[PDB]
RNA sequence: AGACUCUGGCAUGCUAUUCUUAGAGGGACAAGUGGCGUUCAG
């Protein structure tokens, strides 16, 4: 199967918003997405968790500077509110 | 008994197999299924369609 | 600076270097 | 043409190339300049082939102009130049590198030429190019790959200078520059690389943005031919200190630095699969890493998937020689009791563990396989074990199976033989799985078991037919797969008693056993080609044994056509083409039945029949096939719309166009002309780059701080090659997605 | 040669319930392994 654009658009917003709180496996971020987005369809929650898990398997292999500054700004919006 | 095999239980599939075992062993040794194999099968679907 | 101005600067800066390094008939026969 | 010594002498070419240096036409005419450096490629490659050590003598002057001529504003100059330079290096330098040996900065002979090779290309890295940098980096990549091992004492200047390029604010060739350093690490090895460019992640730092973090992804994907002793003495002291540092800041309440320092240490446990590709010192340094890996797999859940992947690299491609095989096998007594604990521990990456198990027994001794087989069998037969623990060690039986001797396997088979009639499907599946895998070994003690219990397995697989569940079929077929391949001629009683199940297995609940069933029916035929001299009538014996499945119940008549569909795809001409049309004629009668299952397999037959059976013999049956298709039904046409529309496409391409309209009824006429319409119709890993919503190359941006100096060695940092510079939220704050 | 809609396999879980029921809750997502792969889609 191919991935629908509504899954992919929902995929990108979660990672840039709540990166710190999620993990690396499918089972971990299935728990998280239940607690972060309402996701009225169960099949959507199934698809959104895996494609988040697929990116998180990839983003971990990259250089950590892109991670490091993103953690810098994540708390920066977090401590302000 | 449903028509497709995905709907009945796993137990119900087994007597489908064991009745199938009987139906070949009575028919492979049948006198008609030694001369014209294709004709007998075609004639069997000929009467089966005619009844239904 | 931008693409158009920098293209002229790099080409001009190269040519000033060459006239610092700067300060016959071609060899028709090959065997002496 | 590369002429011989009588046609062209070696000393003649030196005079030619030195003469041709006086033309170099201007810089940018592109018509002879491509041809000019094409022959200087061709003259040099010929001069090297005749006398090689003189060949390195003339190389530096050509590479003087070749680096210089990269500045020409024509693109086709740039592509042809590096294509010339790469073919010199792949052919004139790479095989002859070993005779040169290691080169220092003070070489004298032909190695001094290699010093001038690299000193030329380093001049190709500064600010003056700024548009050839994608082309120069390709040149360095091959140049690193061929000469990196024997020229590492001179190459330390570029690796600094390659490092300072990536500090540019916007480098479009970040993807390419990693490829240059990555290949360089492959030949030189990270210990040399890290001396020229030191990592500054050596524990404690004042900042948090580590400017040289890109090295660690580079090293992971490219290290394959380095001694393993470097990883023990360098990274593990840094691995433990960073891990200790992050937990210290974890309890301090700050979750940002600890999350950074955790992410750093996890990335530098991923180097070990790289470091264990082809070690040169695995015979002596593997003793230094057994116990630390043993601790790091037991009490570290995060590193489990790394280490279990890491071992699989070491066994498969780091165990070529027999001397390296001993110490891994010498440590098998330690890792199995650890790895057995992790798999059976109640809840986790179990399947990551099981694949590591399957590899690790393939290299170990057989007596310890036998010993743990006894102990695992004790856990199975123990009634004081939970069902989860029972099924957990049952997989461990399957892994332990093929490496045992003939004696232990026969004891194991006697143990498992009463289990095949179990009502618990999980136990029955593992029970057939044991009998499957012991036949899967084509050689060794497992192959000996095949003819030993040959009657015993045959009766066991037949009396266990009546209590076989639906999920248990998939190992049963694979069990049947491996014994038909070694079955003798006096076993037709087994094969003919095996047909009604496997044809019924073609339409069972799973898809896994279906492809197992399709593959077996192929070799069931290959069983019958070996049982007769005249091949066609043997396979005619094969098909007449399955024809009575065409007459019976709606489940089996749809089953039988599916098998006949797959048989004709593989034994195309072995049937005898005269046999085909009657089978097509019977399925035409089958096409009229109201049940949708039979017409599902009937249309699939007609789809494959036209491909296999020849057009002239199909021409004799054009009328008969679509006479039934026309008068099927309204809904049956409406349901199977494109499947009928597909078989319409097959005829009109292969046959005449007008012929089908005369035989079809009215409704299919407007459908068919849509198909004539169709046949006329036919006539890179940073956060920003991965989260993407998905003349021209000569543009440079000067930057203007301290005033710009073009004669500064670090001026290439301050020139650039590219451009500088939604859902609804609930009252709870949770996102709303639709 | 349906990348349309919906839906099934097994529940010794809930409801008046292991064997007959009919409402709901689980589960399955190419999920995982290895090859062919533009190494990302397949």
UniProtKB/Swiss-Prot annotation, chain A:
This is Small ribosomal subunit protein eS17. Belongs to the eukaryotic ribosomal protein eS17 family. Keywords: Cytoplasm, Diamond-Blackfan anemia, Isopeptide bond, Nucleus, Phosphoprotein, Ribonucleoprotein, Ribosomal protein, Ubl conjugation. GO terms for molecular function: RNA binding; structural constituent of ribosome. Component of the small ribosomal subunit. Part of the small subunit (SSU) processome, composed of more than 70 proteins and the RNA chaperone small nucleolar RNA (snoRNA) U3. It is linked to Diamond-Blackfan anemia 4: A form of Diamond-Blackfan anemia, a congenital non-regenerative hypoplastic anemia that usually presents early in infancy. Diamond-Blackfan anemia is characterized by a moderate to severe macrocytic anemia, erythroblastopenia, and an increased risk of developing leukemia. 30 to 40% of Diamond-Blackfan anemia patients present with short stature and congenital anomalies, the most frequent being craniofacial (Pierre-Robin syndrome and cleft palate), thumb and urogenital anomalies. Its main location: cytoplasm. The chain holds residues 3 to 83 of 135 of the full protein. It is found in: Cytoplasm; Nucleus, Nucleolus. One of its GO terms (biological process) is ribosomal small subunit biogenesis. The keyword Ubl conjugation applies. GO terms for cellular component: cytoplasm; cytosol; cytosolic ribosome; cytosolic small ribosomal subunit; focal adhesion; membrane; nucleolus; nucleoplasm. The modification N6-succinyllysine is found at residue 17.
Curated annotation (Swiss-Prot), chain B:
Keywords: Nucleus, Phosphoprotein. The modification Phosphoserine is found at residue 30. Not detected in any tested tissue. GO terms for biological process: maturation of SSU-rRNA from tricistronic rRNA transcript (SSU-rRNA, 5.8S rRNA, LSU-rRNA). Disulfide bonds: none annotated. It comes from the Eukaryota. It is found in: Nucleus, Nucleolus. GO terms for cellular component: 90S preribosome; nucleolus; preribosome, small subunit precursor. Belongs to the SLX9 family. May be involved in ribosome biogenesis. This is Ribosome biogenesis protein SLX9 homolog. It comes from Homo sapiens. The chain holds residues 174 to 225 of 230 of the full protein.
Swiss-Prot record, chain C:
It is found in: Cytoplasm; Nucleus, Nucleolus. The modification Phosphoserine is found at residue 6. Found in the placenta from the sixth week of pregnancy. Was localized in the cytoplasm of the syncytiotrophoblast in the chorionic villi and in endometrial decidual cells at the uteroplacental interface. After week 10, the level decreased and then disappeared from placental villi. HeLa cells lacking BYSL show a delay in the processing of the 18S rRNA component of the 40S ribosomal subunit. HT-H cells lacking BYSL show trophinin-independent signaling through ERBB4. Binds trophinin, tastin and cytokeratins. Required for processing of 20S pre-rRNA precursor and biogenesis of 40S ribosomal subunits. May be required for trophinin-dependent regulation of cell adhesion during implantation of human embryos. This is Bystin. The chain holds residues 50 to 91 of 437 of the full protein.
Curated annotation (Swiss-Prot), chain D:
It is found in: Nucleus, Nucleolus; Nucleus membrane. One of its GO terms (molecular function) is RNA binding. It comes from the Eukaryota. Weakly expressed. Expressed at intermediate level in testis and ovary. It is a single-pass membrane protein. The keyword Transcription regulation does not apply. The modification Phosphoserine is found at residues 686, 694. GO terms for cellular component: cytosol; intracellular membrane-bounded organelle; nuclear membrane; nucleolus; plasma membrane. Keywords: Isopeptide bond, Membrane, Nucleus, Phosphoprotein, Transmembrane, Transmembrane helix, Ubl conjugation. Signal peptide: none annotated. The chain crosses the membrane at residues 543-563. Belongs to the RRP12 family. This is RRP12-like protein. It comes from Homo sapiens (Human).
């Amino acid at each position: 199967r191919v991935r629908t654009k509504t899954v992919k658009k929902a995929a990108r917003v979660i990672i840039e918003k709540y990166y710190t709180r999620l993990g690396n496996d499918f089972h971990t971020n299935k728990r998280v997405c239940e607690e972060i987005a309402i996701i009225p369809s169960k099949k959507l929650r199934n698809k959104i968790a895996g494609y988040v898990t697929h990116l998180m398997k990839r983003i971990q292999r990259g250089p950590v500077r892109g991670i490091s500054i993103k953690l810098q700004e994540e708390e920066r919006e977090r401590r302000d509110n | 008994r449903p028509s497709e095999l995905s709907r009945m239980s796993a137990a119900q599939r087994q007597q489908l197999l064991e009745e199938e075992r009987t139906r070949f062993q009575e028919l492979l040794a049948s006198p008609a299924y030694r001369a014209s194999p294709l004709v007998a099968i075609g004639q069997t679907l000929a009467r089966q369609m005619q009844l239904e | 600076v931008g693409p158009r101005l920098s293209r002229r600067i790099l080409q001009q800066a190269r040519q000033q270097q060459e006239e610092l390094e700067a300060e016959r008939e071609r060899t028709t026969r090959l065997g002496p | 043409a590369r002429p011989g010594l009588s046609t062209l002498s070696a000393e003649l070419n030196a005079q030619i190339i030195t003469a041709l240096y006086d033309y170099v036409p201007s810089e940018n005419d592109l018509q002879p300049l491509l041809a000019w450096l094409k022959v200087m490629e061709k003259a040099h490659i010929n001069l090297v082939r005749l006398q090689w050590d003189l060949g390195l003598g003339h190389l530096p002057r050509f590479f003087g102009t070749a680096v210089t001529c990269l500045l020409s504003p024509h693109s086709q100059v740039l592509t042809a130049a590096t294509q010339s330079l790469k073919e010199i290096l792949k052919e004139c330098v790479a095989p002859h590198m070993a005779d040169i040996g290691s080169v220092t900065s003070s070489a004298s002979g032909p190695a001094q030429s290699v010093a001038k090779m690299f000193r030329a290309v380093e001049e190709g890295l500064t600010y003056k190019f700024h548009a050839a940098w994608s082309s120069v980096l390709q040149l360095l990549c091959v140049f690193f790959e061929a000469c990196g091992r024997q020229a590492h004492p001179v190459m330390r200047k570029c690796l600094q200078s390659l490092c300072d390029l990536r500090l540019s604010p916007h480098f479009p060739h970040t993807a390419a520059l990693d490829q240059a350093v990555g290949a360089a690490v492959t030949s030189m090895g990270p210990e040399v690389v890290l001396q020229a460019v030191p990592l500054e992640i050596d524990g404690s730092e004042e900042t948090l943005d580590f400017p040289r973090s890109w090295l660690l992804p580079v090293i992971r994907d490219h290290v394959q031919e380095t001694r393993l002793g470097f990883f023990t003495t360098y990274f593990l002291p840094l691995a433990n200190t960073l891990k200790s540092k992050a937990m210290d800041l974890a309890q301090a309440g700050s979750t940002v630095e600890s999350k950074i320092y955790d992410t750093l240490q996890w990335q530098m446990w991923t180097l070990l699969p790289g470091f264990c590709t082809r070690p040169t010192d695995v015979a002596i340094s593997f003793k230094g890493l057994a116990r630390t890996l043993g601790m790091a797999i037991s009490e570290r859940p995060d590193l489990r998937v790394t280490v279990c992947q890491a071992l699989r690299t070491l066994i498969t491609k780091g165990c070529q020689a027999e001397a390296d095989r001993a110490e891994v096998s010498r440590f098998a007594k330690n890792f199995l009791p650890i790895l057995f604990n992790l798999y059976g521990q109640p809840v986790a990456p179990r399947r990551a563990v099981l694949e590591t198990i399957r590899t690790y027994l393939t290299i170990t001794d057989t007596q310890l396989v036998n010993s743990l087989l006894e102990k695992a069998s004790e856990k199975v037969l123990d009634p004081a074990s939970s069902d989860f623990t029972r099924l957990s060690v049952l997989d461990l039986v399957v892994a332990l199976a093929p490496c045992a001797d003939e004696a232990a396997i026969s004891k194991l088979y006697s143990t498992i033989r009463p289990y095949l009639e179990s009502k618990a499907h999980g136990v029955q599946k593992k029970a057939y799985r044991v009998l499957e895998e012991v036949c899967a070994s084509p050689q060794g003690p497992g192959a000996l078991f095949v003819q030993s219990h040959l009657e015993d397995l045959k009766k066991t697989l037949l009396d266990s037919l009546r209590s076989t569940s639906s999920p248990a079929k998939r190992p049963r077929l694979k069990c049947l797969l491996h014994i038909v391949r070694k079955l003798s001629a006096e076993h037709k009683e087994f094969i003919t008693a095996l047909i009604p199940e496997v044809i019924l297995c073609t339409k069972e609940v799973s898809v896994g056993a279906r492809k197992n069933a399709f593959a077996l029916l192929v070799e069931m035929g290959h069983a019958f080609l070996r049982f007769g001299s005249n091949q066609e009538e043997a396979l005619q014996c094969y098909l007449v044994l399955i024809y009575p499945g065409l007459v019976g119940a709606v489940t089996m008549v749809s089953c039988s056509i599916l098998a006949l569909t797959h048989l004709l795809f593989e034994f195309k001409g072995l049937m005898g083409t005269s046999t085909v049309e009657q089978l097509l004629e019977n399925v035409c009668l089958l096409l009229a039945s109201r049940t949708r299952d039979v017409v599902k397999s009937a249309l699939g037959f007609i789809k494959v029949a036209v491909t296999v059976m020849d057009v002239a013999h199909l021409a004799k049956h054009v009328q008969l096939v679509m006479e039934a298709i026309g008068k099927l039904s309204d809904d049956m046409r409406r349901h199977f719309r494109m499947k009928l529309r597909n078989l319409f496409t097959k005829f009109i391409r292969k046959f005449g166009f007008e012929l089908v309209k005369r035989l079809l009824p009215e409704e299919y006429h407007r459908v068919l002309v849509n198909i004539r319409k169709a046949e006329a119709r036919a006539k890179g890993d940073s956060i920003e780059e991965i989260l993407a919503d998905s003349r021209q190359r000569s543009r440079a941006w000067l930057k203007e701080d301290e005033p710009l100096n073009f004669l500064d060695p670090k001026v290439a940092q301050r020139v650039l090659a590219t451009q500088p510079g939604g859902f609804k939220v609930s009252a709870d704050g949770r996102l709303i997605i639709r």
